[PDB]
């Protein structure tokens, strides 16, 4: 599938040119999501620590 | 211009080939002219003509 | 290679 891949590559480059012209960051959503996932891991670590200190019976 | 560049790369067409060849040819012209100028300085215009 | 040629012509 060399022909299809070469055409898809051309399409991707044209899409990138348009995105740059429009000043649209195609990776903004993924960046924000990765930051949010880091935050989730932090909060889960805090909750896990409280559950290890107090135990499930007490917490629930 | 960016769309034209993307197309040119897809087609494998070197847009600067002609200018490259021209600059090489201009170097060759300068070399040959230097040789002719040297012969004209050694022999003089009257003899050469 | 008619398809590839036609696409390259369009390009």
From Swiss-Prot, chain A:
Membrane-spanning residues: none
The name this protein goes by in its record: Fatty acid synthase subunit alpha
Function: Fatty acid synthetase catalyzes the formation of long-chain fatty acids from acetyl-CoA, malonyl-CoA and NADPH. The alpha subunit contains domains for: acyl carrier protein, 3-oxoacyl-[acyl-carrier-protein] reductase, and 3-oxoacyl-[acyl-carrier-protein] synthase. This subunit coordinates the binding of the six beta subunits to the enzyme complex.
Further facts: Present with 17000 molecules/cell in log phase SD medium.
Family to which the UniProt record says this protein belongs: Belongs to the thiolase-like superfamily. Fungal fatty acid synthetase subunit alpha family.
Domain of life from the UniProt record: Eukaryota
Primary gene name: FAS2
Organism encoding this protein: Saccharomyces cerevisiae (strain ATCC 204508 / S288c)
Assembly with partners or alone: [Alpha(6)beta(6)] hexamers of two multifunctional subunits (alpha and beta).
Modification(s) after translation: 4'-phosphopantetheine is transferred from CoA to a specific serine of the Acyl carrier domain by the C-terminal PPT domain. This modification is essential for activity because fatty acids are bound in thioester linkage to the sulfhydryl of the prosthetic group.
């Amino acid at each position: 599938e060399e022909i299809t891949k070469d055409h898809k590559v051309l399409a991707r480059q044209q899409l990138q040119v348009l995105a740059r012209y429009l000043k649209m960051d195609l990776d903004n959503g993924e960046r924000k999501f990765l930051k949010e996932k880091d935050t989730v891991a932090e909060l889960q670590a805090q909750l896990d620590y409280l559950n290890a200190e107090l135990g499930e019976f007490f917490v629930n």
